[PDB]
Amino acid sequence: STGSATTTPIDSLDDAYITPVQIGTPAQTLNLDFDTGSSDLWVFSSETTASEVDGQTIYTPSKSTTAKLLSGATWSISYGDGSSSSGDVYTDTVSVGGLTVTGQAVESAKKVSSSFTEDSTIDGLLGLAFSTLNTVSPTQQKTFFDNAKASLDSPVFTADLGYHAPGTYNFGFIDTTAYTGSITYTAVSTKQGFWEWTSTGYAVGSGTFKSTSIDGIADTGTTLLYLPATVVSAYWAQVSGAKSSSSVGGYVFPCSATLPSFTFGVGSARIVIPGDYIDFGPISTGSSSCFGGIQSSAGIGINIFGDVALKAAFVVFNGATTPTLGFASK
Template identity: 30%
Template sequence: MAGSVHPFHHRYLLFLLLIIGAASTVSIAAALSLDLHHRFSDRVRQWEEDHGLPGAWWPEKGTAEYAAALAHHDRVLHRRSLADGSVLTFADGNATYRIDNLGFLYFAVVELGTPNMTILVALDTGSCLFWVPCSLSPGIYSPGQSSTSQKVPCNSSFCNLQSNCSGANSNCPYFVRYADDSSSLGILVEDVLYLRREDATSKTVEAQITFGCSEYVEGMNTALPYGVFGLGMGNTSVPSILSSKGIILDSFSMCFGVDGIGRINFGDKGSLDQEETPFNIDNRGFYNISITGIEMGNTSIDLDFSVIVDSGTSFTYLSDPVYTKFTESFNAQVQENRRKPDNSLPFEFCYNSSSRYSFRRPNISLMAKGGSKFPVSHPMLMFIEKQQNVYICCLAVFKSHGFNIIGQNFMTGLRVVFDREKLSLGWKKFDCYSTGNSSTTPLQNLSPAPSPAPSPGVAFEPSTSAEAPKPTSNHSQQIYPPYFVPTSNGKS
């Protein structure tokens, strides 16, 4: 946050003081000399490793990752000289809303164009492009009705589909497909996104950004038209654009409230007491971290695997052997009887419960690289069986094939910081209402559609496919809509 000193800087100040302290033992008549070492040098790396700090996670000298890290470091210094450290959020306020009938995703209200148009968008850290529906519905957003709108030409650095262009000055097309096979296509435009400072001034900031103007959407519920606000690490994401212009520090935070109300703040680097782990370098723009084990109640599971942290995926996906070890350990420590497989429920591990609050589960923590614990406070989803009035508690984890994703259900109850400057993920148990004042625009006029929409999920290149669970046709006929269950922690 503005005015605070980051722990990273504390460590290097300490490093400098240690050098000065060692030099002070030399004769006063001798000239004081200091050896200066680059942040990524072998000497500094060794010193960090000897003191249990994250030097071992830095890229090896001479590798492509090493060169990329140096270039990233230089860009960060330049951006810092431009940004004043202010935290920004949307002009309508920093509140976000989990809408269960739209795939259990978090949404925010954004304002675009001149005059400004209000649009509902799903917040997705698993993809980079921000796009909104244009010709799909009247009164949403139209480039022709905004005096500040400009179409992006094919020779722009933001245009990733130049091979599909008829000429350098023709309109740049975009196409994005998500893990559940939903997709959006259209053209790129540039216009004003309205933000405001999260301080006493609440000053409005007009940021010129590039985003997608969607002309066709497939696989998403369009009864309530909404866009997807990509927050990934690619150059087309809004955090990347804002930080490259020096408007914010290259970091943002999202708070995921237990009650479905959250927060988002751009330029927020979190607090000194938060847990952290480094990102794995991922050229696809994902927030990828390493997990070294799982604490499940009275059991510790030694596993090494990487996961994508994705707010745009409703639930959590684990591939084998992680999925099997996770679910078997969970099942062994639950006292309630497991239900037989049921086509009306999309989850594999479900249990009958006598009431909303009687189900007890083991404590769950993911052990992140570096030793930090990522607490999983709300892994369960509850259904109510209509005919027998039975409460059904399900472990909201799906088995995947070849990829692991921490969905937003595992982030519930946390403030998660995506520090792209430091290349680290931070988190802390948090009350989202304590993050400051917020304008909580009511959503009465944004009535959700009656049927759930597919999760935007992680965005993949068009040549890549991924399996996602599909709800069964008789699901809504047998059980009431699900909601997150306030289960009790504790060893069984």
């Protein structure tokens, strides 16, 4: 089997991407944030505290003839941005782009933090990291990809995120028309539960490439590119007037600037992020200070190849017995 679904930016900045997902019988379609940095499929639901729902579409398990309470199971998750959610668990039929999994754990939110409530466009998350990170207790649950894997034509999914435009998540096949050149594969460590890999270096603009190992995670659920402070300083030093602002929470730059590109290494290959992809617009409405799309990871504990980086590439998440990542230009 295969599946193919379009993923659409939630706003004009590509702050996140939503993909429609069919849950239950008859189908209830929710727009989920596919997140290769976490491993829970959770949704706003008929059980979510009413004051914490503000425009999201909800899953109502009582209206699904295939929903079953997973008795005793609870979940609770906290994300790197400080947001969180928790609740109980149903199993139900879940379909993405024509690919169907029966018995998928659908984690129903009883509580969500304010940032989720405040984003009416995201009805939940669909985790695509390794199932060892799934938070369901006392019986850990598998991700949608893990459950689908054995049925897929090939044990892979691909992320093809658009810049200010829709893109595609494919399951079970590699669309050879969706990228240019060849795909370069690189080793993955699953030791932390992430799609963790080592970039071979970087360049700023037309500058020379610096060969240096940068361990980080391919994370579709993180907006920006978070890299070591040395690398980030070298980037922003090429932008007149750019500075790190403690009050804003990162590097800002004059909105009048033209940003240089940023290149990252994948083995001997190179992925170029155009400068425009690094512009996240005014820090507040009407400001002439703009927020940068490359930020320091120094306070995170891990480097994160988020959407800014991933949307410059066609990315293969290879879930074979020994997982690997593939990157191609497009």
